[PDB]
From Swiss-Prot, chain A:
InterPro entries: Ribosomal_uS8, Ribosomal_uS8_CS, Ribosomal_uS8_sf. Part of the 30S ribosomal subunit. Contacts proteins S5 and S12. GO terms for cellular component: cytoplasm; cytosol; cytosolic small ribosomal subunit. One of the primary rRNA binding proteins, it binds directly to 16S rRNA central domain where it helps coordinate assembly of the platform of the 30S subunit. Pfam families: Ribosomal_S8. The keyword Ion transport does not apply. GO terms for molecular function: rRNA binding; structural constituent of ribosome. GO terms for biological process: cytoplasmic translation; regulation of mRNA stability; regulation of translation; ribosomal small subunit assembly. This is Small ribosomal subunit protein uS8. Belongs to the universal ribosomal protein uS8 family. Keywords: Repressor, Ribonucleoprotein, Ribosomal protein, RNA-binding, rRNA-binding, Translation regulation. It comes from Escherichia coli (strain K12). Disulfide bonds: none annotated.
UniProtKB/Swiss-Prot annotation, chain B:
Keywords: Ribonucleoprotein, Ribosomal protein, RNA-binding, rRNA-binding, Translation regulation. Induction: Part of the metY operon that extends to pnp, also has its own promoter. InterPro entries: Ribosomal_uS15 (IPR000589), Ribosomal_uS15_bac-type (IPR005290), uS15_NS1_RNA-bd_sf (IPR009068). The keyword Flavoprotein does not apply. GO terms for biological process: cytoplasmic translation; regulation of translation; ribosomal small subunit assembly; translation. This is Small ribosomal subunit protein uS15. Part of the 30S ribosomal subunit. Forms a bridge to the 50S subunit in the 70S ribosome, contacting the 23S rRNA. GO terms for cellular component: cytoplasm; cytosol; cytosolic small ribosomal subunit. One of the primary rRNA binding proteins, it binds directly to 16S rRNA where it helps nucleate assembly of the platform of the 30S subunit by binding and bridging several RNA helices of the 16S rRNA. Binds to its own mRNA, stabilizing it 5-UTR and preventing its translation. One of its GO terms (molecular function) is rRNA binding. SUPFAM superfamilies: S15/NS1 RNA-binding domain. Belongs to the universal ribosomal protein uS15 family. It comes from Escherichia coli (strain K12). Pfam families: Ribosomal_S15.
Length: 129, 87
RNA sequence: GGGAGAAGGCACGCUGAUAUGUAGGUGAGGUCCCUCGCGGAUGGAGCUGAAAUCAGUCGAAGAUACCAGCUGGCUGCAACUGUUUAUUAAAAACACAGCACUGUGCAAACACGAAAGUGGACGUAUACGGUGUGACGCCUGCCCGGUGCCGGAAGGUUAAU
RNA sequence: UUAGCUAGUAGGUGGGGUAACGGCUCACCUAGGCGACGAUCCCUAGCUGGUCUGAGAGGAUGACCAGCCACACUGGAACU
RNA sequence: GGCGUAAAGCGCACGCAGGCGGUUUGUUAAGUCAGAUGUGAAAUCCCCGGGCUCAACCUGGGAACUGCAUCUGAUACUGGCAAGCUUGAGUCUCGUAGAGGGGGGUAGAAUUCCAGGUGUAGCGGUGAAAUGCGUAGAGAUCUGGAGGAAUACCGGUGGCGAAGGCGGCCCCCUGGACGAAGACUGACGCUCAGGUGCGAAAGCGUGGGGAGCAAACAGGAUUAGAUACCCUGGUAGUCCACGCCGUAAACGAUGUCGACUUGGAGGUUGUGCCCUUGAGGCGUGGCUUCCGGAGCUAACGCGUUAAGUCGACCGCCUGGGGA
RNA sequence: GAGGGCGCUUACCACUUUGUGAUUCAUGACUGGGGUGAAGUCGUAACAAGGUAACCGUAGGGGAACCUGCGGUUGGAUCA
């Protein structure tokens, strides 16, 4: 069924960008709030917004540049069938520095560049290229 | 099943005698229909298209009763004794 | 299911200990009830009594005598248990459960009897007679020219009258 | 194209034995333990640090060198 | 890495173990991460260096020795544990649609057989003929039976079922789906190795039936021959009840579940509203066939029912033969 | 006298012996099929509507390709 809510979120972002949507929507959660917060920080979405009292809908407003999409590629890393926990020297560096990789560390959720500047690994949720 | 029989079932197993959705109620409705339908599958033996519906009812009763056994052990033991299932 | 007791091998006497006769069986007392007697419970005396283990010892040989499987391999024929040539032949012959064909609608067919009758049967086509084959598995292929048998009565020949 | 295996076998208590725990070895009892996370069975093999290759993950392999194990014609047994 | 067509999705479903698991809080801190400690023998490999005139070689220091264990932390994810939610999954209320299944009745049309009437010399057959049926009176024809099987028109890429499949009408038993407003339980979920159940036709066993049709078989032709097509017959079988077999180009050559992504054309089955103001119009569901966009693809083509973008679990392939 | 030694004896155990399986290799008249071969013989089943559309399953038959029955598939051709 809904065996991966994070891949539901990422697949919704990828589909909406490749099909030229503007305001995509998904059911909310705490990890989805944290990942969308990372994306709004680094600049792969315009702004996110979680609306709803008991069960909310998280809304993502996608960015564009000269018509083309902003997120070139986006994928899972640590899928639930096979999880990928990485130490600090064996951290990734996606797109030779250009893209970002979202890592959940002990200090919340943060981009892998901040994870290297804080000196700890974690779990790699996605490779926003 | 008939409306008087299901009203009897929810009255004899119900939480507030209205809810009709509790786990004891669903197992009671399933077991009532299974022990009613064994008589159908004793006289008609080649009735496979309803034998599959009986197997669905059996598996669903077993899923609910295993969830009851995980949830409350005392309620599961008293319910299987009150109905008359074997295990 | 069988093969199979397959084959093949080990122990086997007497004495002592466990146990001065064991486990088990039988149950006298005695005690209590007792719907009171050929009644019922603990109660186990006495009586009987395997079987096993350890030790010792004897003999050349311990199931010591009498009684008491020769075993295995390949194959023919017949499925088997049965039956027969009393008195030279016990089988590969006969039967057999099973298979099929055929007859028979009951006052059955069929047999024994000139005939009555009776068996069939005090049974009624899932029954009965007759024929061939002889469990079970795989199967039963072609021919209706011959001789039978069954269906035809249009025609040829055809008896008594 | 090996699914069953195991009678000192899994455990207990007592005795004995060993430098030392332990079925190591016996008496008695319990009837267990191992098994689809591959027991049992068959075939091959000394293992490792390494070496060769590979961008790397790996693949092959164990010469010299070094550590450990086993054996000393074959099969045993004990002594000092 | 791959599965529509190149080799590859079990025939289809149920389901134990196993794998994965929505969302909120609190705790624990097992997995995860981070520091330290012990350790990873030396040799080798590598980085700086020294020597043999150079190199090979010898050698000093260093990290590495991707590990293991211990202590100490952190709490985002995953796990355990405890409490909650309601969207996932399910239950009730009321209908709709349906060749869904099982059992028993019954109806007519037609074919064949029989029996009887008429009436006379042909019928049947193909490319053309013949075997066959006919002067014992057929074929045609009217009446009365008997029998078995399949259900014309409806009928439509229509419906239902998980797959095979299911087709006149009626009753009895019965499963499933879907829709509406409510209510309720509150993760009860998904997939599933082994395991089980269903599984067309042909085939087998036992016992019935046996009209048509018809492998085998016979006869007639065509042919060079024709063990075939075509013709005349015709037994298994088809059929009914019990079983057994477990296979198909079991096909959408497309495993199940779930999410997201431009449209059009119809069909089907509900349902809300609006004045059904006449056989309307505005929406929401489910199911279903055709065209097609970006995307994809080796191309063909698939295209909101994906072969698009993804996730969970399972099955399977590693050149053609041999097989 | 204790205690010792030799000797006898019992326990354990190797070589050896019998019986009987399990596996594996070699060999074996003859045979089931498979593959390769020089202008061999008999056909002509498939590819076009391959001249009877092929094919799948199953059964029967037949010198052999294959034929026919029953069910299924389009991966079959013609549409004025
Ligand atoms: Mg249900
Ligand atoms: Mg002979
Ligand atoms: Mg005999
Ligand atoms: Mg005899
Ligand atoms: Mg006699
Ligand atoms: Mg004689
Ligand atoms: Mg005699
Ligand atoms: Mg004699
Ligand atoms: Mg008489
Ligand atoms: Mg005979
Ligand atoms: Mg004979
Ligand atoms: Mg004969
Ligand atoms: Mg004759
Ligand atoms: Mg004749
Ligand atoms: Mg004949
Ligand atoms: Mg005659
Ligand atoms: Mg001890
Ligand atoms: Mg001791
Ligand atoms: Mg490589
Ligand atoms: Mg040694
Ligand atoms: Mg030696
Ligand atoms: Mg490939
Ligand atoms: Mg092909
Ligand atoms: Mg293929
Ligand atoms: Mg399929
Ligand atoms: Mg399933
Ligand atoms: Mg979770
Ligand atoms: Mg921890
Ligand atoms: Mg070292
Ligand atoms: Mg130098
Ligand atoms: Mg936690
Ligand atoms: Mg609610
Ligand atoms: Mg609640
Ligand atoms: Mg299976
Ligand atoms: Mg059949
Ligand atoms: Mg039959
Ligand atoms: Mg046959
Ligand atoms: Mg028959
Ligand atoms: Mg007939
Ligand atoms: Mg198959
Ligand atoms: Mg089909
Ligand atoms: Mg199809
Ligand atoms: Mg297939
Ligand atoms: Mg792809
Ligand atoms: Mg299309
Ligand atoms: Mg897909
Ligand atoms: Mg493809
Ligand atoms: Mg041809
Ligand atoms: Mg031809
Ligand atoms: Mg052809
Ligand atoms: Mg042909
Ligand atoms: Mg063709
Ligand atoms: Mg033929």
């Amino acid at each position: 069924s809904m065996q991966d809510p994070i891949a539901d979120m990422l697949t919704r972002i990828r589909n909406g960008q490749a099909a030229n949507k503007a305001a995509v929507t998904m059911p909310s959660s705490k990890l989805k709030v944290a990942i969308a917060n990372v994306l709004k920080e680094e600049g792969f979405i315009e702004d996110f917004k979680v609306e709803g009292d008991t069960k909310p809908e998280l809304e993502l407003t996608l960015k564009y540049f000269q018509g083309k999409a902003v997120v070139e590629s986006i994928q899972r890393v640590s899928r639930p069938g096979l999880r990928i926990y990485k130490r600090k020297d064996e951290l990734p560096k996606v797109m030779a520095g250009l893209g970002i990789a979202v890592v959940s560390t002990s200090k919340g959720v943060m981009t892998d560049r901040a994870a290297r500047q804080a000196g700890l690994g974690g779990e790699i949720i996605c490779y926003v290229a | 099943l008939s409306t008087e029989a299901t009203a009897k079932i929810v009255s004899e197993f119900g939480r507030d005698a209205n809810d009709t959705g509790s786990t004891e109620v669903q197992v009671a409705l399933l077991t009532a229909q299974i022990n009613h339908l064994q008589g159908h599958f004793a006289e008609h033996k080649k009735d496979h298209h309803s034998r599959r519906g009986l197997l669905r009812m059996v598996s669903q009763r077993r899923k609910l009763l295993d969830y009851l056994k995980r949830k409350d052990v005392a309620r599961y033991t008293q319910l299987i004794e009150r109905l008359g299932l074997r295990r």
